[PDB]
Amino acid sequence: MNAIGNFLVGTPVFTIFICLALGYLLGKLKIGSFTLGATVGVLIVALLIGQLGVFPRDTLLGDIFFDFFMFAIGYRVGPSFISSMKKFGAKIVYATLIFLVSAFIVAYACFKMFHIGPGIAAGIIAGGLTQSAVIGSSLETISKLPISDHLKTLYSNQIPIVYTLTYVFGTIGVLIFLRDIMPKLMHIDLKKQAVKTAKELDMIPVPVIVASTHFYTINDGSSLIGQTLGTVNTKFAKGLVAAGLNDSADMASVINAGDVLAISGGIDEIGRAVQEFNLLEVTGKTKAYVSKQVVLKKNFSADVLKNAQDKGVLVATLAGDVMDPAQFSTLKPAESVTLVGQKDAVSEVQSQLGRLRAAENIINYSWFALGIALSAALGIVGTKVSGVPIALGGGTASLIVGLVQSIYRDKHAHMDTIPDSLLEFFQSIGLNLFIATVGLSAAKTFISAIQSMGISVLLIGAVISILPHIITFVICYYLMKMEPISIIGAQTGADTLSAALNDVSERVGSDASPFFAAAVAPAYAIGNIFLTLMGPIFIVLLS
Amino acid sequence: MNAIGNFLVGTPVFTIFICLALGYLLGKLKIGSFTLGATVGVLIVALLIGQLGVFPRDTLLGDIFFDFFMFAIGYRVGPSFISSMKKFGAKIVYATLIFLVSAFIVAYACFKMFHIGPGIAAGIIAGGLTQSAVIGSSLETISKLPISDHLKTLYSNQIPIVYTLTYVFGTIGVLIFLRDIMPKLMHIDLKKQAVKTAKELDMIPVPVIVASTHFYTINDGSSLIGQTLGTVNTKFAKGLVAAGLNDSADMASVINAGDVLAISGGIDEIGRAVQEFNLLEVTGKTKAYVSKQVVLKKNFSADVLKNAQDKGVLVATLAGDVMDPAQFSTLKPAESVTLVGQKDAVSEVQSQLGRLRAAENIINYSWFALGIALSAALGIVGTKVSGVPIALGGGTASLIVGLVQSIYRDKHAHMDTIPDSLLEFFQSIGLNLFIATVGLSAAKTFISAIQSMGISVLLIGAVISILPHIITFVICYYLMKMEPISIIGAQTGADTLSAALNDVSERVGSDASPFFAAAVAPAYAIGNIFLTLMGPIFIVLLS
Ligand SMILES: N[C@@H](CC(=O)O)C(=O)O
Ligand SMILES: N[C@@H](CC(=O)O)C(=O)O
């Protein structure tokens, strides 16, 4: 009975990664009509495990794995923010401002009416308004602010316990309220209304067809044998070209017998070409005919574009698509494009068109590390407001750093892009690891604190977690008469619920997912910054 | 001058992630004809940075980020190990055994001839034989073994300093020796000889063609209008089927006008079909006609396979390819396969064929965490040999756990697969972070130790890093007369050099990369286990 606790305290890695394994299973368990979720399951399992031992809490591991989560969230939100700012109106920002004001007023009123101490107030804020940087910011503010030392220790110790108590209700309750109750009240379907609104706007994604090189070989005795390749290419419709016979690129090489054309262009265009003149579609074996993407120079000469069209290299954008010849003159200078053709001829046109680009798969670890370092440096800075040393915080600055990096990489393509699955791994495991560490830390005195303050730490959290959403929903839908889905988006962005974001995104469908992302993106940054700042101000005010 | 040090010691995240950013740039700097590399650049930058402050070392962060690296390496090596054991001979294992014996003899002789103390001996082993778990295993062994307390502190403190000194020469020197000097001595080219040997064997990868659904629409008045769909499907050659008109699947629906066939099969087969009867290749817009992968049941009925061939569902393996009908009877029971067809008809055949499978992109975080926990638990176990409490170690057990998990997931496909870029991120950043932490730790007393022991800690490391490779190369090539490339593979696997592995793999070409991986894979596990065990034995013997 003691040996198991000795083993658990001896090996922290086993404890941390065994409080993270069973949590996902508990979250994926289906009980009744609600699923607990990964974070809540991890918190419950950590709370149960932590009773056995006296495990302490490591600050650096949690800080790093939370900075990774914040950077991943900022990177994912990045591209949608500027698009929502351009196209969606300011009502998205206005809803967040209303929600923040309402939460401030309700929290102040409840804390004043119940005389809640500053430590419990910080815990209730950090739990009901689901933000994790509040714990660290409040600890730093409590350390800086002048009080008795015993008061400092008590206030610093009481925060994680109240955090773990109220976090349990916040995620599940607000998820249920924003996923079922509000759609039932508005008498809409989440899929249908969002699809209709996305159809009204132009957020609906449009698929892009990419040209490819298909190796059609010649039918012998087709009566077209004996025509020069340049005239055959001019015979092809707009957007077509033949790379050349075998792996060679020669202007005047008439058809001999059964040789390959390697037609490049759009699928329907190749189809009409085949119906114009029959050809054998053969898989072929050649590694020379490969496309390449290259960033252009500032001069971005178009005469070389015409000469490459004559030469046998199809022009396409970075995504890959045939484009109008009139776009040659009015192209964007120094814009990366993709071309298909011969092994070295594409490189020749590249040398005459611009510097070589870089592949998507490779990752700039130097840029990753520099982003993390700049996030920490930005979080260092802080100002004082009437004796309150407020600071941006470590996690909050990472969101801004990721946003700026994504926006700047969208324009300037010199830097490479982080793979998609890496971001999902980052956010998921980082958030669950931070939650597991906190829950393992605050576990021994859990039962003592739930004996000391039973109902005056859960009902307050429930009220502060539910009431502002109801007020802002009523104001937005009944009085101001906004659109249906943007209300959900703005509320779930202001409350900073990534689980609710993901659940509504997966329920709504892939068609309107770039709509919901645009609805949520402007809210997240303002909500995070103001909720991070709310903590120290509340501690100072109730103190 | 003091403020910068105060900032650096105040914020460990900034220091750790700023000693990791400049390191990659320094490694990618081109000086002369050699590149320093990421790990060596990080060590140099960490050593320069650590002079300013008094930063301590965190054990948990390094342990976790090294366990991730070891798990990623084991997962990548996994599939090749059993294939190399089956096809490559036992000479691969024999070369590693010879190398380990030679390294043991040379190290014992040098340490006895120079009376090197046990701590310096552990450091020299951990540096010259590039293995990082030696530090932790030696620290644990020194803690357990009975000596005077001052001796314990001195021996524990001297290890990282000697480690950082000799690690610099090991990677660069052995990389140069195994990449240029040995090919010059054997008078071979790394690309050509490996390609020839892979052609002699059957390690050469073979590309696989996957069938797809192409929506050919009907030419009006083609004289084939008015034939039932079943007879048209039987008219199609072996390996072809038409899903059905529009998005429907009806057996008797004659061609009306300009309707789509949605031909499915191999590209060349569709080409001969189009030449048999002309069709318009149109991109089309339909989301119903999507393929699915499903794991089969044990009964794996083949009558339903024939009925699905009649029905209009093409049969393919998980990779995706047309397969012979005679393979229907002799298929593997409960083997996952992929089918193309209608939105729900594929699900019908699935219901009659087996349980639904899972997608590639999704990751089982529960399996990841359980693997890490089992790695720690396996590393806990240990035995005693004449008073030496040897143990497997934390990092070493992770390699075995990853190997077993990859091998078991290859057979049983219920568990999902980790994405590829995640493994590369894991190994790279984890190894560089551990190296940065160690270098930042052992920096203040670096100059004092290089004043105390100048030349008697570098020449010994160079000799122990160079000489065993020369001996084993001479024995393998001149006396035993082995094959050329397997010598390089076995030596680079026995020395456990991931940088050398990656560099030779990228230089050799993608064609022979699954050959070099098979040549290196058997060596790595035995080398890691024996090099991890070598440390405590050496400490006890020289003590
Ligand atoms: N999405 C939330 C998760 C949490 O609070 O733990 C946040 O980043 O604030
Ligand atoms: N590939 C080496 C790297 C190192 O020693 O740091 C190893 O895992 O042992």
Curated annotation (Swiss-Prot), chains A, B:
Catalyzes the electrogenic exchange of aspartate with alanine. Keywords: Antiport, Cell membrane, Membrane, Plasmid, Transmembrane, Transmembrane helix, Transport. It comes from Tetragenococcus halophilus (Pediococcus halophilus). Signal peptide: none annotated. The keyword Protein transport does not apply. It is found in: Cell membrane. One of its GO terms (cellular component) is plasma membrane. The keyword Transmembrane helix applies. This is Aspartate/alanine antiporter. It holds the Pfam family Asp-Al_Ex. Belongs to the AAE transporter (TC 2.A.81) family. Its main location: membrane. One of its GO terms (molecular function) is antiporter activity. The chain crosses the membrane at residues 4-26, 33-55, 88-110, 117-139, 159-178, 362-381, 385-407, 428-450, 455-477, 520-542. The gene is aspT. It is a multi-pass membrane protein.
